Amino acid sequence: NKLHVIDLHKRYGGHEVLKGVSLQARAGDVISIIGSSGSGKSTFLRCINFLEKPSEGAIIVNGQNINLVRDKDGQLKVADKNQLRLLRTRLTMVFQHFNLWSHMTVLENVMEAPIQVLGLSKHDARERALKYLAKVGIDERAQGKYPVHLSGGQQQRVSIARALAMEPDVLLFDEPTSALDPELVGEVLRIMQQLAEEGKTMVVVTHEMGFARHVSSHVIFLHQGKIEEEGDPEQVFGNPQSPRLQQFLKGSLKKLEH
């Protein structure tokens, strides 16, 4: 379907972090990945778009394999540059940090990649940027401001609009609400829920079990670099089988994120 990640491993030097994980997202799937800090969730997402290099595995986007070749360092690299670019355009990522260009206004930040990477006219890029900024609740008065002027919550909403304006096949999110004021978490989770309700294909790493249970079509529990349990949210959360998953669900209640 849209994304198929097969038998992915990843090492940093000699330290193996991901030990064989797979994921398959079909159109409209909303996959939440949960697990302890250190289980390798961020490494998993960063390998999907090659921000990090896998040591083993395959990545297929829209049914087309992304050719990989073993590099100098013994890791896997994307053979063809266009497959890497094509890639970063069909999959977009929203991170814990906001990742906006400090010298560009909110509007310019959302217009930039559609122009520079997709080759769109300024008019077409502006129309997408206005559409998606409205969707995330960033109004005209805020559009001429710069990142330094905005709260973390506002910057993350702008980052979500930036990802949406690329009109990708899959949206990847790595704990997007983790650095936000706790009072602002709900609002961002609701924007992500609205995208899911509109049929977007999404992969989300999160500590907010409310979103993982309530919005996901599939939940993956990552444990020490492997998928220890996965399935429908009602099963994973309501009828956990693995003692490791049961312990994670109990312990997570007391951790303060925030």
Ligand X SMILES: Nc1ncnc2c1ncn2[C@@H]1O[C@H](COP(=O)(O)OP(=O)(O)OP(=O)(O)O)[C@@H](O)[C@H]1O
Annotated binding site for ATP: 37-38, 40-43
**Residue 41 contact partner, candidates its own copies, ligand X, Cl ion, none, CB within 5 to 8 A by sort of partner:** ligand X
Interatomic CA distance for residues 41 and 210, integer angstroms: 18
Instruction: Name the DSSP letter for residue 177.
Output: T
Q: Contact letters (x/-) for its own copies, 225-254, by CB under 8 A?
A: ------------------------------
With binding defined as CB under 6 A, does residue 73 bind ligand X?
A: no
With binding defined as CB under 5 A, does residue 252 bind Cl ion?
A: no
The DSSP-derived string for 136-152 is TT--HHHHTS-GGGS-H
For the CA atoms of 38, 42, 48, 49, the dihedral, rounded to the nearest 10 degrees, stands at: -140
**Residue 148 contact partner, candidates ligand X, Cl ion, its own copies, none, CB within 5 to 8 A by sort of partner:** its own copies
CB of 20 to ligand X, least distance (A): 15
With binding defined as CB under 6 A, does residue 137 bind ligand X?
A: no
Sole window of 58-66, 74-82, 107-115, 145-153 interacting with Cl ion (rule: CB under 5 A)? 145-153
Q: Give the nearer residue to Cl ion in terms of CB position, either 62 or 151.
A: 151
Instruction: Name the DSSP letter for residue 58.
Output: E
CB of 41 to its own copies, least distance (A): 11
Q: Where are the alpha helices (DSSP H) in 75-226?
A: 81-90, 106-116, 122-135, 140-143, 152-165, 182-197, 209-215
Interatomic CA distance for residues 152 and 154, integer angstroms: 5
With binding defined as CB under 6 A, does residue 41 bind ligand X?
A: yes
CB of 15 to ligand X, least distance (A): 6
Interatomic CA distance for residues 81 and 190, integer angstroms: 36
- Sign, Cα dihedral of 190, 129, 124, 60: negative
Give me the count of residues in the chain: 258
- Please give the residues from 4 up to 33 whose contact with ligand X meets the rule CB under 6 A: 12, 15, 17
CB 165 within 8 A of CB 157: no
Q: Give the nearer residue to Cl ion in terms of CB position, either 78 or 93.
A: 93
Among 89, 143, 217, 224, binds Cl ion (CB under 5 A): 224
CB 219 within 8 A of CB 212: yes
Q: Give the nearer residue to its own copies in terms of CB position, either 16 or 88.
A: 16
For residue 22, which of 241, 185, 226, 223 has the smallest C-alpha distance?
226
Q: Give the nearer residue to ligand X in terms of CB position, either 10 or 114.
A: 10
CB of 239 to ligand X, least distance (A): 25
With binding defined as CB under 8 A, does residue 24 bind its own copies?
A: no
